[PDB]
Each structure stands twice: as structure tokens, then as C-alpha cells.
Design a protein around this ligand. Structure first.
Ligand SMILES: *[C@@H]1O[C@H](CO)[C@@H](O[C@@H]2O[C@H](CO)[C@@H](O[C@@H]3O[C@H](CO[C@H]4O[C@H](CO[C@H]5O[C@H](CO)[C@@H](O)[C@H](O)[C@@H]5O[C@H]5O[C@H](CO)[C@@H](O)[C@H](O)[C@@H]5O)[C@@H](O)[C@H](O[C@H]5O[C@H](CO)[C@@H](O)[C@H](O)[C@@H]5O[C@H]5O[C@H](CO)[C@@H](O)[C@H](O)[C@@H]5O)[C@@H]4O)[C@@H](O)[C@H](O[C@H]4O[C@H](CO)[C@@H](O)[C@H](O)[C@@H]4O[C@H]4O[C@H](CO)[C@@H](O)[C@H](O)[C@@H]4O[C@H]4O[C@H](CO)[C@@H](O)[C@H](O)[C@@H]4O)[C@@H]3O)[C@H](O)[C@H]2NC(C)=O)[C@H](O)[C@H]1NC(C)=O
Ligand SMILES: *[C@@H]1O[C@H](CO)[C@@H](O[C@@H]2O[C@H](CO)[C@@H](O[C@@H]3O[C@H](CO)[C@@H](O)[C@H](O[C@H]4O[C@H](CO)[C@@H](O)[C@H](O)[C@@H]4O[C@H]4O[C@H](CO)[C@@H](O)[C@H](O)[C@@H]4O[C@H]4O[C@H](CO)[C@@H](O)[C@H](O)[C@@H]4O)[C@@H]3O)[C@H](O)[C@H]2NC(C)=O)[C@H](O)[C@H]1NC(C)=O
Ligand SMILES: *[C@@H]1O[C@H](CO)[C@@H](O[C@@H]2O[C@H](CO)[C@@H](O[C@@H]3O[C@H](CO)[C@@H](O)[C@H](O[C@H]4O[C@H](CO)[C@@H](O)[C@H](O)[C@@H]4O[C@H]4O[C@H](CO)[C@@H](O)[C@H](O)[C@@H]4O[C@H]4O[C@H](CO)[C@@H](O)[C@H](O)[C@@H]4O)[C@@H]3O)[C@H](O)[C@H]2NC(C)=O)[C@H](O)[C@H]1NC(C)=O
Lengths: 110, 104, 52, 126
């Protein structure tokens, strides 16, 4: 499509893990593995969850995890809670030193 | 031996190694003008790099032949450099010290 | 851009004889500073020569 | 300890330019890059440019190339970004984000570690 391909739907329930995928071109995120994921509550700045596909920063819960293979990189939420009602944005190395970010996935307690 | 035709001025790169001990070689150590070669038992790893991301421009100069030159630096400007593991370099330099002591 | 320990190069623009041997165009290329020397006693700090 | 306090809502008409500023504290401002990202409604995160507060080099995504310029001053410790040729679609929230750590030896501009985020400014057009 444009920028980074990303879903826009929910496929799980409370207590269940959910996996979300991200994709660009092979010149994009598939090159280096420089990836990060962010979490935005409504009316708040996105918080900083995952970086370099599989690492996370201090203060973040251990629930979030990720992986990549080829041109696809993915974020995994483990055991959804009511705090997970948010939008999740993929961002990665964008080619020609640029950085790009995706459309964003809504998540709920469906 | 598969001699390396290596171009290197102050250090010897990817060269051969001595079998049992660090070695020193010189035509006449009495002279201050003569070069002194040092040959190591184990190698000291060196890594160099350009962090600058050059793009190869293709200028045409007269009949068909091309002249290649650096285009834009697609990326942030950074320092080209080299690295050596500090403790291993210190060990190798002190061992060349013991081998220099045998002559001094 | 501020100078320092960054190894800044010089963006030098110059005329070339294109494939049309008796015709020319302006062309630009970036050269490292050691490759470049100020021109001559007819001094102009904005004009340079290759070190050859 | 980290905070990037920003300007207010700079509502402006099309054709003009909008200049946002984010003042940094906590981090030693010269050490960390500043990236910029935009939340265009409907669209997701949209990334504009990075800038090296220590050097001054900048780049932009191809959507924004030639359209965005940036500046700062390290003594006060405040960062600026200005967008030219403003239009209706630019109605969005601008966010000033920092990281990774600047080094002279390996490039870390594109490393997308948006460690800390400012509270935002609501740019509206018009
Ligand atoms: C050649 O050679 C060369 C050399 O010789 C090289 O170069 C190099 O390289 C390398 C590699 O890479 C690099 O590294 C890098 O580094 C960076 C930096 O670091 C540093 O720093 C920091 C800061 O500091 C500051 O601050 C503080 C407080 O905090 C203070 O105190 C101090 O002082 C400082 O200050 C400043 O200012 C001042 C003024 O005056 C000055 O002086 C100074 O100097 C400065 O400037 C720190 O922090 C660090 O530390 C840390 O780390 C380390 C390492 O790791 C360690 O050791 C330590 O310990 C620490 O740790 C941590 O962690 C842990 C864990 O466990 C904990 O526990 C603790 O607590 C802590 O926290 C140092 O010191 C850095 O940054 C980097 O890393 C990063 O990034 C990367 C990329 O991206 C990644 O991968 C990783 O992982 C990381 O990440 C992280 O971080 C970031 C930022 O930083 C972010 O973004 C992310 O997200 C993450 O986050 C996390 O963490 C953080 C912290 O950091 C936190 O906050 C959060 O929350 C989370 O958690 C790296 O490491 C280096 O740099 C270089 N060098 C130079 C000089 O540049 C080259 O390369 C070669 N080449 C070749 C080719 O080879
Ligand atoms: C160090 O320097 C080197 C050299 O500069 C860097 O490597 C270079 O990196 C370039 C990427 O920035 C790469 O360029 C690519 O060139 C190919 C042509 O061979 C071109 O097709 C690529 O453009 C597509 O992909 C990029 C992402 O990589 C997209 O941003 C771009 O829009 C293009 O995708 C569009 O078209 C596709 C095909 O139709 C669609 O499937 C896709 O969805 C997308 O569609 C949108 O955009 C359209 C406009 O483009 C629009 O009309 C449409 O409606 C959609 O909205 C890309 O330009 C160089 O090949 C590569 N060179 C080498 C030698 O590696 C290297 O990264 C630098 N190092 C670092 C660390 O950065
Ligand atoms: C090494 O040196 C060589 C030269 O020897 C460098 O190559 C040259 O690099 C120049 C800069 O990139 C490049 O100039 C550009 O050429 C394009 C051709 O399409 C031209 O359109 C550009 O014109 C814009 O920029 C100049 C300033 O550079 C402005 O004075 C001019 O008004 C233009 O700005 C307006 O148009 C832009 C779109 O083109 C808009 O985005 C911009 O906002 C602005 O808008 C005005 O109107 C708006 C209302 O519509 C209003 O809101 C706004 O405020 C403005 O009023 C520019 O001239 C040369 O072509 C290029 N030459 C060659 C041979 O390559 C090379 O980059 C150097 N390399 C390095 C690494 O340093």
C-alpha cells in the first residue's frame, strides 16, 4: 500500500495473546532489523514498547514481544488486559536513512 | 607460501605468523636509521570502517569512458576510523617490549 | 555545518567535456579534502584544483 | 526526568508555514538526535525528519523532501522544526521525539528508538 503495510483489526479476547505484523519492501525493514513498536492511549503520546524487533526498554511490562523474518516483522501481545485498549504503531528503518511508520492497529477487549 | 601482496605502512596486515615466539628482525640494530621489523606470535585484530554512506556517481568524460565520484552522503556524516582491542594491544606491545629487552 | 572530528568533504562543481567531445556541461562531485588544493597565485578561495 | 515541552496549537492558513519548537531537559541535549513524527487523522504515524543537534545535518522522507527545515540552539537547549507550503491535510498533531544516542563512529540517525515523547501541539488548517 504505502509507507508500512500493517493490519487494522483485532483477532483475540481477554486473557489471549494477539500477534500483529508489519511489512515494507526488502530495501526497508527487511534489511537491518531496526524496528520498534509504540502504544498510544487516546489523548496521550505513544509509549515506547519494543525496539530492535525483540528488545524492550525499562519500565515496560514483559508481556510484549516480537520477531521478524525476511520482510515481515511482528509484535506479540501476551495475555490481553483492559490496559491494552490502544493503537499500536509499527516503525522501522525506512531506506536511504529514512524512518517510516505504519497505519496503526486498534486493540480492544473484544 | 601464499604471500600476501598487502599495501600497509605502519602495521603489517593479514600477514604470516611465527610458530612459537614473537620475533624481532633488523639488518643492524646499532643504526638509528635502519628499520626494525617485529613479527608476532598471535594476531591483534583490527577493524576499520567508513560509517559514511557514499553513493557512487557516474560522470561521463568524453568518448564513453566514465569517471566515478562520490555523490551525496545519504545518511548522517560520521567519522571513518579504526579499532583495536585495547588490552590485547597492550599485551602485544609489552611482549614486543620483552623481545626488545633481549637486545636492550 | 559545524566543522570538527567529522571528516567533512568539499562539494566541488566543475565543467566536463560530455560525450559530445566539443560540447560541455556543468557537473558536481564530492572530493575529500586531501584530494583538493587551492588553485594558484591568482588567488580565489572558492576555486580549487585536484592535487595532481 | 526526561521532558520535551512544546509550543501551543499553531493554527495557520494554507500556503504559509508552521514552526514548532520542543525544549529539551533531562538528557544532555547535544547527545541525542531529535526525530519528528506526525499523526495525520485517518493515517497512522507519519515521520518527517531527523536532525543532529551536535552537527546540524538533516534529512526528510520523500513526501517531505525540500518542504521541511529545522534548527535549534544547544545552549538554551531547544529544538525547532518548520514546515513550508502548509495545507489542509497537514492538520495533525506534531510530536518531538529523541533517540538514539549520537556517536562519531557509527551512524545511529535512522535507529528508530523514539525513547521519549513530548506532549504535542495541535496544528490545524484552517
Ligand atoms: C570502534 O570503537 C568505538 C569505540 O572505541 C565504537 O564506538 C562505540 O560503539 C558502541 C557500540 O554501539 C557504542 O555503544 C552505545 O553507547 C550508547 C551510549 O552509552 C553510554 O552512555 C549512556 C548515557 O550516559 C550518560 O547518561 C548517564 C545517565 O544515564 C550519565 O550518568 C553519564 O555521565 C552520561 O553522561 C553524558 O553526558 C556527560 C556530560 O559531561 C558526558 O561526559 C558523557 O560522556 C555522556 O555524554 C549510558 O547509559 C551507557 O551506559 C549503559 O550502557 C552500557 C553499555 O550497554 C553499560 O555498560 C552501562 O552499564 C549502562 O547500562 C544500562 O543498561 C543496563 C542493562 O542492565 C542497566 O542495568 C543500567 O542501569 C543502564 O541502564 C554508556 O555509558 C548506548 O546508548 C548504546 O546502547 C543503546 O543503543 C543501542 C543502539 O540503538 C541499543 O542496541 C542498546 O540496546 C541500547 O539501547 C538502550 O539505550 C538507548 C539510548 O541509550 C535507547 O534508545 C534504547 O531504547 C535502550 O533504552 C534502554 O536503556 C536506556 C539506558 O541507555 C534506558 O534509559 C532506557 O529506559 C532503556 O532501559 C550503545 O551501548 C558507543 O557509544 C560507541 N562509543 C562512542 C564513544 O561513541 C565503534 O562502534 C567501533 N566500531 C566498530 C566498527 O566496531
Ligand atoms: C546507503 O545508500 C544506499 C544507496 O542510496 C541505500 O540503498 C538504497 O535504498 C533505497 C531506498 O531508500 C533503494 O531505493 C529503491 O529503489 C527501487 C528501484 O530499484 C524503488 O523501486 C524503491 O521504491 C519503492 O520502495 C520504497 C521503499 O524501499 C518506497 O518508499 C517507494 O515508494 C517504492 O514503493 C512504491 O512502489 C511499489 C511498486 O509500485 C509499491 O508496491 C509500494 O507500495 C510503493 O507504493 C507507494 O509509493 C508510490 C510512489 O513511489 C505511490 O505512487 C503509490 O501510490 C504508493 O503510495 C526504492 O526507491 C535503493 O535501491 C538502495 N540502493 C542500494 C544500492 O542498496 C541504503 O539504504 C543506504 N544505507 C542506509 C543505512 O540507509
Ligand atoms: C553539491 O552542490 C550542488 C550544486 O553545485 C547541489 O546540487 C543542487 O542542489 C540544489 C538544492 O537541492 C538544487 O536546487 C533545487 O533545484 C530544484 C529543481 O527542481 C528547484 O525546484 C529548487 O527550488 C526550491 O528551492 C530553492 C532553494 O534551494 C528555493 O529558492 C526555491 O524557491 C524552491 O523552493 C520552493 O519550491 C519548493 C519545491 O521545489 C518548495 O518545497 C518550497 O517550499 C519553496 O516553496 C515556495 O513557495 C511556497 C508557496 O508555493 C511557499 O509556501 C514557500 O515559503 C516558498 O516561498 C532548488 O532550486 C539544484 O538543482 C542542484 N543542482 C544540481 C546540478 O544538482 C548538490 O545538492 C550539493 N550536494 C551536497 C551533498 O551538498
Amino acid at each position: 500500500q504505502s509507507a508500512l503495510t500493517q493490519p487494522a483489526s483485532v483477532s483475540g479476547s481477554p486473557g489471549q495473546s494477539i500477534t500483529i505484523s508489519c511489512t515494507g519492501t526488502s530495501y526497508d525493514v527487511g534489511k537491518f532489523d531496526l524496528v520498534s513498536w509504540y502504544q498510544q492511549h487516546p489523548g496521550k503520546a505513544p509509549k515506547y514498547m519494543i525496539y530492535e524487533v525483540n528488545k524492550w526498554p525499562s519500565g515496560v511490562s514483559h508481556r510484549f514481544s516480537g520477531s521478524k523474518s525476511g520482510n515481515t516483522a511482528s509484535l506479540t501481545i501476551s495475555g490481553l488486559q483492559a490496559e491494552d485498549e490502544a493503537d499500536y504503531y509499527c516503525c522501522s528503518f525506512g531506506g536511504s536513512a529514512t524512518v517510516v511508520c505504519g497505519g496503526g492497529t486498534k486493540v480492544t477487549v473484544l | 607460501h601464499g604471500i600476501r601482496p598487502v599495501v600497509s605502512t605502519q602495521l603489517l596486515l593479514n600477514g604470516s605468523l611465527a610458530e612459537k615466539e614473537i620475533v624481532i628482525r633488523s639488518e643492524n640494530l646499532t643504526n638509528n636509521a635502519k628499520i626494525i621489523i617485529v613479527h608476532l606470535h598471535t594476531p591483534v585484530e583490527i577493524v576499520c570502517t567508513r560509517p559514511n554512506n557514499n553513493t557512487r556517481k557516474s560522470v561521463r568524460i568524453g568518448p564513453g569512458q566514465t569517471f566515478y565520484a562520490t555523490g551525496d552522503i545519504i545518511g548522517d556524516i560520521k567519522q571513518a576510523h579504526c579499532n583495536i582491542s585495547e588490552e590485547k594491544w597492550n599485551d602485544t606491545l609489552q611482549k614486543v617490549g620483552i623481545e626488545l629487552q633481549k637486545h636492550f | 555545518v559545524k566543522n570538527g572530528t567529522v571528516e567533512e568533504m568539499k562539494n566541488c562543481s566543475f565543467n566536463t567535456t560530455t560525450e559530445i567531445r566539443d560540447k560541455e556541461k556543468k557537473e558536481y562531485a564530492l572530493f575529500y579534502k586531501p584530494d583538493i588544493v587551492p588553485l594558484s597565485e591568482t588567488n580565489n578561495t572558492s576555486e580549487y584544483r585536484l592535487i595532481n | 526526568q526526561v521532558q520535551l515541552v512544546q509550543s501551543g496549537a499553531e493554527m495557520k492558513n494554507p500556503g504559509a508555514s508552521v514552526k514548532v519548537s520542543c525544549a529539551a531537559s533531562g538528557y544532555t541535549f547535544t547527545d541525542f538526535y531529535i526525530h519528528w513524527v506526525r499523526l495525520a487523522p485517518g493515517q497512522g504515524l507519519q515521520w518527517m525528519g531527523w536532525m543532529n543537534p551536535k552537527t546540524g545535518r538533516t534529512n526528510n522522507a520523500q513526501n517531505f523532501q525540500g518542504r521541511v527545515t529545522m534548527t535549534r540552539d544547544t545552549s538554551i537547549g531547544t529544538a525547532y522544526m518548520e514546515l513550508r507550503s502548509l495545507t489542509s491535510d497537514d492538520t495533525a498533531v506534531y510530536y518531538c521525539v529523541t533517540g538514539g544516542w549520537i556517536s562519531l563512529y557509527y551512524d545511529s540517525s535512522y535507529y528508530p528508538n523514539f525513547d521519549h515523547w513530548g506532549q504535542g501541539t495541535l496544528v490545524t488548517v484552517s
